[model samples]
Target: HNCFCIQEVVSGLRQPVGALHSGDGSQRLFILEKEGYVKILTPEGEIFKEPYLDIHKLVQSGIKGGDERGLLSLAFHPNYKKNGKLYVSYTTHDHILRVVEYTVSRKNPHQVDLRTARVFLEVAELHRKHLGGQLLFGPDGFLYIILGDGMITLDDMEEMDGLSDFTGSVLRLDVDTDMCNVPYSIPRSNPHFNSTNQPPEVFAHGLHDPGRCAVDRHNLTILCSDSNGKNRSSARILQIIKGKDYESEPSLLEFKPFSNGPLVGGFVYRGCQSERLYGSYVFGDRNGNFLTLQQSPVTKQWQEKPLCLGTSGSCRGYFSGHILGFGEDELGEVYILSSSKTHNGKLYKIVDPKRPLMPEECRATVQPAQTLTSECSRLCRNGYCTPTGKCCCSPGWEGDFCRTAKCEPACRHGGVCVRPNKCLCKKGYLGPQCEHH
Candidate 1:
């Protein structure tokens, strides 16, 4: 059953390819128009005065138009204020896939130093179509890059002849490295290290064209969207767990379509506003399918559930390429990216329902606020209410209702906090509550 609604947040963008938060908690959204321009939308979804970070000059030199070229993807560093670093992946006029880094000027956040743009990795172009161009930051602070196999070259089928050369593969890079005086580096712990068998930057190979990927900070899992060829049945979503080596046949949790459908772009839901989908992942299929996948904590498998966003034949004519990129606000609400002939290109956000779902554990016997109250002195008498009518929780309990236990914080000692009331959790600690190591 479908329980979500999509509202057009903005319109008239020329094939928006990438959408991301500015990371300043201002609710401002940065969107990449495939025509090689980066625009900013205010919290209210209104276009800002000027383009937030423009690289039109860099891309105008030689950008192939249509579906697979121009400004491909952009990612703002989690520590954007301190580092002022951002990454973009695009194909040059020559059709070569390139990843580059740029820094925003201290004098102006809107101005990007294109001169500071340094190439991290370059792959020779195989074909003009299917240039997978999505850049994402994983839970481990490493950059994850998706590259499409040039659709016309039939290179994706030739996995034996080194698939790492601009074909279908995901690349991982360490943004902290000084490679070629740039802000990105290849992680030393990468799977292909010291081995001539594969490329060191490659995390996984054998991909046709990947549009988008998202990492679950809560569980430290990576989700990839494979937009396979028309005849390939393997176009699906793959779940990658951290700390596990994927080099030599990396373990994966694959979600296949029910009726031989094609999958495209998607992202994991990290928001907390919706109870039914707190940790659920949602994605869009170019074949006009919207899917909601539930992750199993124990088995690390995915359960696919379809959301009826459109008709089955909606995407049949134009090969829309779906290209849906997700975005969330500071309050942890989800949004979807949709592009098509009918609507041109637009961004839609999930709306709140008239009635919220009730929690299953409402009748469970949890601890009461305080026993010190005159009426209920037997249960929690010593705890008292503050002047603001808020419960003055005991040392062991917290939250306004004194519900949370005084347990260890979810994240490790120095983990960055991405979401409120939830820790990004350090390298060792892993769990929804961030208690286990």
Candidate 2:
């Protein structure tokens, strides 16, 4: 997995910031364009002519200028198949950062129900730039919003407290319930849930201007790529914990700016193709120099190396387009979204040049799939093992070994099964799998 190549998936987008899967079993990828449109990309490699969502009139991103304001991200509810609820993040015309929620059309799965749009959270910015516009639903089942320091530089210190404003902090909310009659509820376990000084929704603060954030599926921890500051020159990979400010803690890993631009965040490598990269954190800068970060097993120190980009097992060049961000599919594969300017945005899937193409059926049809030295972690009880070590379980069957059936009335946000029948809930939640808040 040291050598890698990016296969172009789709192009002709207007500054596509990122792409994401709905997690409802449909392999459709929702592409987030900076100009305020969500386009659909089918599993069969088709780009829909019409957008899934369009809110250009309300957005304040640049169509031609270098304005950083625009649509930033879209995240679907974990039980999106049933609730059809989706979240959106963007900068409004008045320089306000807005996180809105919407539901899908009852009749058409591809279209959104525009009438169901509701504003869940809003924050006015101190500066137009450094709008940390990333929205994600963590394993805890709470919605986390990344807000930059708002000040173009860290020089401004007038309004930098978590209690006074949400600037330079991550806010967590329970979108399913209302708090104080607001559309979103603050999680009771939030560090500042009942604090007299801090906002109840504030989860972690002191992030200068995080570029992106991701949840580690293995241990369920939150990680973010924090940009450089006026004093600190290196970007950071931080382990964000509840209410722990980074001003006192140290970063897990620090990556110097590639050349001039600050670091942009990406996801951990959980895809099936590359075993070498499976547990490593893969990220790149705005300059398109991809790299991988992993902890040395013996030394326990973090290490970083270039993720080579070339074909035929040779490291030749760098990722062509200026990198905007990265994405992860349902099956754990990674994709990079980038643009040359306003248009010509492209999506490229990161693939191992050593491995053959994944087969549609459980068996490998293109070529013999590589075998790993390790045995299957879980037995494929209800499904057959693919050429790779993955279990291609039958429909409705999921989990590593395809033993656990898909949960109906799915576990409440942040609810996870502890054993065969019992469910474990996030702190402050009770009952069988997120039944009580």
Candidate 3:
């Protein structure tokens, strides 16, 4: 009874990549534009006079300004309000991926202290594609970074240089303390930390292209999603474990290539508004697929279902573009950040379905070219509605009212059978037996 809707929040963003609320209790949303700037959506429902942070000049966002490059994400320090610290993951002019730290201005807590910037770590980018730029501070207080295969799927593994360099991996770093010699220490807790010729920074590996990362505060797990290469793309979820190849494990959920595009990290629904969705982790796919993963009460296994964006008329509304990120406010409400080729990007809030769907709104998943509405009009109540706006009887259950349900166990020989043992006969047949043909 608690299905959600894709409520349009706002439009006219320049290909927004990320949307998050500042954890400092501001209730304001910070949105990342692919071209390189962090803009704030205020509680008053307006964009702040000035940007929260701007590094557009430093981003290597491609000429057309869409795709995998640019200032992709921002993570506020776990104690951001007190320390005014935060970090961002971006692609540089030289095509290097950087995760850097910054602090809020001493003059105004609202502005960033650009002078306090510090480089956390840099990874080599052999190819300019599939950088895997999502970042978040996990429940354990470690900053997790997602990296895609350098550019060439599995073939790019050994091709990437350095003793610790890796593509197609999920990396966890200790920004709180220097565990590794680097600015951001490698969590020795990683699965491959002790493995020779491997990056100590990697927590898990063997992902085709891990596009997004998330932490499930309820189940105490970390998750990342892959956007398969195409419709053949295996849109799947990786349950990350230390020292393990997450891809080696069975996926939590997957879809065929028709549902393409990279995966975006989802948020577990804890909002007071929808109890039915209370514990479900809802995620989105770039190619217009929004779905959720719930645990079966009887089997305890993961159960997945897609949100019919009114495609076959499952819901009344639809998004005409790529579904990117899922955002959650402190209240636990979720939002969608999507971009389209026809217009600039837009943000949508996922809330309960506005109202019931009427027959006028019921569209068919697939309708045949010819359906006679006039012939089935009187049987509307129990009839199947088709895309062509016609009502038709369900097979094996037909009558003048389409109410005579029984049709099996033997009804043949130029004879039609109605409900309640009544006989429906053609001119060639006669009697209850209708034995004459």
TM-score of 2: 0.73
TM-score of each: 0.68, 0.73, 0.68
Arranged by TM-score, best first:
2, 3, 1
Off by over 4 Å in 2: 63-66, 152-164, 178-180, 233-261, 297-299, 313-319, 359-437
Cα-lDDT of candidate 3: 0.62
Instruction: Return the lDDT, model 3, position 209.
Output: 61
Instruction: Extract clashing residue pairs from model 3.
Output: 191-243, 227-262, 231-257, 232-257
- What does candidate 3's lDDT look like per residue over 1-437, in tens digits? 33456666778887788788656666678888877888777655777778878888878886663357778678887766545567898888236888887755545655664665577778767666667767777665678777776565444555644523655666777776512234565554555555565557776555566655555765246555665445244544445444433322223444342233455656667765565666776667666566676667898566557765542233336765777676776555677888877347888776655443222333223211121223332244454422122334546555444576564544557565665355677777765656667
Q: Which stretches of candidate 3 lie over 4 Å from their true place?
A: 1-3, 153-164, 178-181, 192-197, 235-265, 297-300, 309-316, 353-437
* lDDT at residue 107 of model 3 (Cα atoms): 56
lDDT of 2 by residue, 1-437 (tens): 35677878888888888999887777788999988999988877889898999998888886454567889889988867655678899888136888888767655778886776678778877566667878877765678787877763454444444322777777778776512245666665666665776667776666776777656756255566665455543545445445443222233455553333456776778877765677887767777767666668898666666777766543234455688888787667888888884368989888776666573422322221121232321365644332223455556666777778665556677887544445667888877767887
What's the candidate order when arranged by decreasing lDDT?
2, 3, 1
Best model number under lDDT: 2
Residue range with the least summed lDDT across 10 consecutive positions in model 3 = 363-372
Backbone-clash count (model 2):
1
Evaluate all candidate structures by whole-model CA lDDT and list the values in order: 0.59, 0.69, 0.62
